[PDB]
RNA sequence: CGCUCUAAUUGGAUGGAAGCAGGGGCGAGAGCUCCUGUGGACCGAUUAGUGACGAAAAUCCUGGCCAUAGUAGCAGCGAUA
RNA sequence: ACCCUCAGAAGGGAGGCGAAAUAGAGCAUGAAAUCAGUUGGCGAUCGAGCGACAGGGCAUACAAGGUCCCUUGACGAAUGACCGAGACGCGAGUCUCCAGUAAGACUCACGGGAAGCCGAUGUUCUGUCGUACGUUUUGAAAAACGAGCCAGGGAGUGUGUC
């Protein structure tokens, strides 16, 4: 798996990390890049609010086929990717607990850096016309958050 | 609290009239990169010089702009190839016993690679002795 | 609204070729050039023949488009665009600081090039550039 | 005998692929193919005298 | 020029070998060499040999991987749940 | 191990062991393709064998390269004047002298200067040239054939005789 790739001064700030998850790669590059540089509290409700569908996700690299969003500033593709939502938050009450058990205001810390990686693929195969079969696989993520004081 | 090199750092050889003329032309002049052709734009191609083969080949045929074959036209000055570019003349060296029998006016010692710190040190402190310039020289906080 | 033009030349009873020749090459030389009364200017040779090539220049076109201007005003101005490597930074940069104008909204009398002047005692046979605008259906607005 | 221990075919043309013999749709037996025969060993007959 | 192993002669290495990464120097060039980081145990040079010795290509072989794409499909059948 | 978190024998955080956990289980090393984040350079008015060679911008910890710029002066190949004087030509212009003089690439010396400063490396801009590579072919950028990308694999070998 990954190990953080960024430095991190443990007097000011706390880490955690999500474990092959199998959820979209590409739906956790699109929400880390939009929660990066929050309050952690900030992330969580905003996170909420994509899963309810209040609040859509800017889907700027991986967008093909997607529709409009009117909610989306600066750009027009946007979606609601309930699923990866969901881990990133529980990332980010992980993030928080270790950070409180530290003496820190969990929530009021920024999110410093957070980053999706592809660690692999849980790998499937579905049968198709002809006698063959195709894969039919499972990405697997691993994410890394780091809280910093500000 | 400051970091200083080991020996004769600055020393500088002396060179006939020609030889630093001819030396001085080689710096001038120099030299096309001569990588292998195509080498930019396909990774599985390294850039370490094979003749273009091609019958077809542009740079084979010698169209301008396709970059220049290796001929014996383009090879420095005799008097002068293979210099380090302070002018000295190098000599590869791997102990003590090495040093023995350089010129520390025309050439100058590099220590090779493997050469552990311990050896360094005797090689280093018996070279600056003799007047003999160590290319690579170990830096020490003085 | 303005234009700091270093030169001023007056189109009226020129060649649009000769002048548009020499505004190009002093706007390569970095000059800011006004051409002045460009309805006035004018173009030799049998009226019929002129209108039929630049009614040719209006009917081509297509998807991709070859739009042509039909005023004196953006006429001259793609004449001299035509002399100027205007797809170039130095091209455009030199095309762009270089204006053409219906009437004259200076103060001052534009400067007539040596060499494009034309004597009309002496010649029948030309057209002038408003001319040509009117039959192509420009609006008559100088 | 080394490599040459298969009965691998070559399907030839029609299906898009190298004229390679194939056994269970692995190559075989070919010196460019892995687990195939080498081309030219060390031989035993050889005089080394 | 470079690669493997053998022999003779002669050297380097836990005061850090090979390899790898980034960078400096030399050579027309094959390629040689140094520095730094990583690495943590092996590595050369000369000379005479040995050869399963050099790849951009063969719809070449095997493995790994990207775009394709968050796309097609997850509707159609007289059993619409 | 203990503690915190969690639906949790998961995972995460902190912690303990060891020279090393970036040795924590396909667990020595850890290339390329390639992915995430990020740094430098370019970037929403502009054109395509992706570059070679020149030259500008911006960027640069040390080490392993140390050069480079301007005044002046010395040397000074081929080449080679202006000005002026005199003489021709309808004219554009030319001849003779000045003079093979001044100039003239490189190199060097004195004086002054630069340390992102010179080289170099990354990227980018400008100029010149430029429709891959290999093969088939009289003729290949080819609307002829081959290749998605990278690593590794992949073709004059043996006996006998001449
Ligand atoms: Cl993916
Ligand atoms: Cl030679
Ligand atoms: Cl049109
Ligand atoms: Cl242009
Ligand atoms: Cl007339
Ligand atoms: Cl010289
Ligand atoms: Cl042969
Ligand atoms: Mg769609
Ligand atoms: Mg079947
Ligand atoms: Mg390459
Ligand atoms: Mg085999
Ligand atoms: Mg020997
Ligand atoms: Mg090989
Ligand atoms: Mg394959
Ligand atoms: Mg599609
Ligand atoms: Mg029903
Ligand atoms: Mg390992
Ligand atoms: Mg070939
Ligand atoms: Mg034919
Ligand atoms: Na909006
Ligand atoms: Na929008
Ligand atoms: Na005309
Ligand atoms: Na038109
Ligand atoms: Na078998
Ligand atoms: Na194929
Ligand atoms: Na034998
Ligand atoms: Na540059
Ligand atoms: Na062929
Ligand atoms: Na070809
Ligand atoms: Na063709
Ligand atoms: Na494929
Ligand atoms: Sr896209
Ligand atoms: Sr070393
Ligand atoms: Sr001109
Ligand atoms: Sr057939
Ligand atoms: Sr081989
Ligand atoms: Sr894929
Ligand atoms: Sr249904
Ligand atoms: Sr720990
Ligand atoms: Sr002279």
Known sequence: ?150 | TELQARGLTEKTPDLSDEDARLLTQRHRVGKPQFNRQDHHKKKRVSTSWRKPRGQLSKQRRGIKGKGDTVEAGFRSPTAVRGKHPSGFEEVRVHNVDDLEGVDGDTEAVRIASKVGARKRERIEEEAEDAGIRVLNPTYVEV | AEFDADVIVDARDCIMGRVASQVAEQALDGETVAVVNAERAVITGREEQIVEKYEKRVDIGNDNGYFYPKRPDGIFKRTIRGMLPHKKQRGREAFESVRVYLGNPYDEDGEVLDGTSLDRLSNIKFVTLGEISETLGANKTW | YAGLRTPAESFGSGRGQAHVPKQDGRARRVPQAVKGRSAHPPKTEKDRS
């Open chain 1, 1 to 150: 798996g990954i190990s953080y790739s960024v430095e991190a001064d443990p007097d000011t700030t706390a880490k955690a990390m999500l474990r092959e998850r199998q959820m979209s790669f590409k739906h956790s590059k699109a929400i880390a890049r939009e929660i990066k540089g929050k309050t952690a509290g900030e992330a969580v409700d905003y996170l909420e609010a994509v899963i309810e569908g209040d609040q859509p996700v800017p889907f700027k690299q991986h967008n093909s086929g997607v529709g409009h969003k009117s909610k989306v500033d600066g750009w027009d593709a946007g979606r609601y990717p309930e699923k990866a939502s969901k881990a990133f938050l529980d990332l980010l009450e992980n993030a928080v607990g270790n950070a409180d058990h530290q003496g820190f205001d969990g929530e009021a810390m920024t999110i410093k850096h957070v980053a999706a990686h592809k660690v692999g693929e849980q790998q499937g195969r579905k049968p198709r016309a002809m006698g063959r079969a195709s894969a039919w696989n499972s990405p697997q993520v691993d994410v890394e958050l780091i809280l910093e004081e500000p």
